[model samples]
Target: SVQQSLAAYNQRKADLVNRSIAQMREATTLANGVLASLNLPAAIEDVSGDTVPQSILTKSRSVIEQGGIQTVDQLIKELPELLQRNREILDESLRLLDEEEATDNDLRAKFKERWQRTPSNELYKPLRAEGTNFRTVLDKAVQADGQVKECYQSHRDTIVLLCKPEPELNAAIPSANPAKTMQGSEVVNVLKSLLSNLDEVKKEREGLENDLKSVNFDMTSKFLTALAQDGVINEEALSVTELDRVYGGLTTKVQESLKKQEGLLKNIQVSHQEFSKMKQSNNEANLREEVLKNLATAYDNFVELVANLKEGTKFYNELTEILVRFQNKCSDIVFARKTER
Candidate 1:
């Protein structure tokens, strides 16, 4: 499990993110309190206008001063955990809802059948004619019947009263399991559990690979950019969605950001299921195997997507900074009079 080996790597990332977020909050709180304490009515800056409240700017400034975490670079360096946390929460939630488990009973039966054929013990034939019940005979031989047969029988039993003593023949008889053909019956059950677990691991591997795509920012962004450049980002080109925006006002915006992710996850799940059904389906083996290979291809695609998204995130955060300043300047001009101290 290379994946299991690498999963521990995520813990280091999680720790870094957690610490940074905590530090940002601490810095924000301290900065805001200090700034407010130094407040003088005459020194107060006016910043109240349409879409810009004094309270929001004041809070923003406080956050900026606290730990002086003013820019998105600070957000990136100090709290890279945001998207990772988002993915973690979504992944945990999806696990709770979409998790699956299955058994491979038929495979176990096939394996077990091969285990019980020992040399010279191929015949499980019943000997009802010679013995009324072979099971009963075998049971008696094992338990109460192990004692030596009495000589001369003393005419004790109804059927054996007329029979002559045959101690020599009975004493020389070989055991029923001379070849030891039947192995322990437990082989089937053990193999069944082990194989079932293996099947589960295989399926989970596909799902994990699919999820690995979601947090990918680079490949997704590049795909989006390419789509936009080629007009594939629109429904007219890709034909994946119906409208630019669905009934939801921002569905297009949100779904555009998520379309590739959704597609990647769905494709992996569908292909894995199809692979599982390869024996049951009449489809060509080549086609079925092709689907199975998607697990790997999707993984590489996701890695690329993450790289692109990270670069875009930094650029977008910078844009947000410029907009924030522009928003503040507008607020200051509009509320030139009647401003709070």
Candidate 2:
């Protein structure tokens, strides 16, 4: 009777330990899954955006599949190589499609129709397509049954180490799981290392992105400032290509920023309101405010520059119009004074 009771007690203890082991394993898997889903791609996209190519994703997937790697930890070990490959492909593609090369009249004529008509055009097609594929490859590689299963296998022993109910059984028995001992600290350490490397890459790329944005800012500022000076025919009808040309080549990050700049620039009225209001301020004390006064001088200077740009005697025609406006307004003021006096 005592033997039967002891046997039953041992069985219960074993069952309880087994259940705890299973729960802990599930928790570790869940932890890795959340980390990957939240941190990994956000790091990559922060810098290069959608620049990685489809070919890189395909090649990396092939490598991971063939290696039989199963865990996020194992897959992360090989990520630097994958990142280098992706960077190479993006740099090579960007070189071939550099904005400076596309400025030729013939090239513009060929590409302009699509750039104007296509939603994103060929210029932006690679970003969305390759970015989608990159995520797909990662998802396939990190699943529980993925090729890099070694990481999970290697860590399983550690996860269950403390859960073994009998100290003697835990100490004497060796685990057969291929995953590294799943001590939570060890698993977390591996992932932390991977995240640190990703952060480094992200930091480096962010610096590059800032430089690109500055280039865009300068080019964009110069173009708008010049246009306002030279006088616009119809500000609403201005072509976006003019903005793109000046600010286009810096980097992908900057190019995206310029998209927002386009919307703001479109709504501007070319200082017409300020110029018109100034004409009404002929009173002695309201006389010639600095801001309003500068606009007229700047406009006049811009008109001169435009005349020069037109490459001929166009200045005289613009000059004649200015004098005619002054004549009509001044003559009316003088006639009113003569009748009152």
Candidate 3:
């Protein structure tokens, strides 16, 4: 009976090994494809100077040798939780994006309110319109920057979590059981490769976040700030007596400076208009879209990887459970042989 049980376990283990190999191969192939589609380099160096895809593959293969069914099954149980975590992270990214879109709409509505308000003086009409437009552009840029920062931070956190090394099943299990000692290391290796791939994606996301900060809202804000500080420069400071005194007391040099200031305001407004145009341009939209696209793609990659690992581990776990049961039966026979003698 012991001999028969051993033969059965060997046969079952052979089949399980074949299936596990096939599953890992398929998963690795898919990951490579995803990496290619994203135009990522085949390999990268992590903080430790190890090459990514290579190290990942190396670790993956090593796991099969060093670990057994237990490790594979453990991974199957673990990967889904990571996948769900990734899903939750992406869901939050989408939520932040929705809020940003809503804020843009709200800003537009506010701009409309300002645009529609009738100025009290014909002289102030152009100034009022220009001021309102400047405010709108500045506000929109600020809002966009805010959203970019939030999304970037959220993605960074997820990436960090995803990159973390998984805990060892070997370390968790009781040391007394020799049969259960061999655990699969495949899952850890796969995750390492995934992290390497995501490293490139993370860099791209960071670049986009930085680009959003370059919209030059600072200049507009400074001008607006100066406008508020000096009563003479402010359109809202429209007292005729104050205006007349400020204008009359101005020296020739001061008068020329005022003329230059007028020209500067016009130039600044032109620049602001161009900035707004760029914001509306497909170029800016494309940049933003690319970042979001990468995020969604990364999320999809995680989904597939998780599914594959889960499937592979399930196969390993089921076979291991049966094999262990049979081995226990064989152990009983051995026990009887010793005791009955």
The numbered model that scores best in TM-score is 3
Score each candidate by Cα lDDT. Answer: 0.31, 0.36, 0.38
Better of 1 and 3 by lDDT: 3
Of candidate 3, the 10-residue stretch with the lowest lDDT total is: 173-182
Candidate 2 per-residue lDDT, tens place, 184-232, comes to: 3443444445555534433444454444334423333444565556753
lDDT of 3 by residue, 178-292 (tens): 2121122343344334454444433443343333323332233443455466644533233333323432332233334334434533443343333333222355334433432
- Note each model's CA RMSD in angstroms: 42.4, 38.8, 34.3
Rank ordering of all candidates by lDDT, starting from the highest: 3, 2, 1
Where does model 3 exceed 4 Å of error?
Answer: 1-286
Best of the two (1, 2) by lDDT: 2
Give candidate 3's error at residue 162 in angstroms: 15
Selected candidate, larger lDDT, 2 vs 3: 3
lDDT of 1 by residue, 136-190 (tens): 4334433421221131122122221112123321222122211121122243234
> Which runs in model 2 stand beyond 4 Å of their true positions?
39-46, 51-341
The list of candidate 1 runs beyond 4 A from truth reads 1-284, 337-341
Worst 10-residue lDDT window for candidate 2 reads 41-50
TM-score (all chains, Cα) for each model: 0.17, 0.18, 0.22
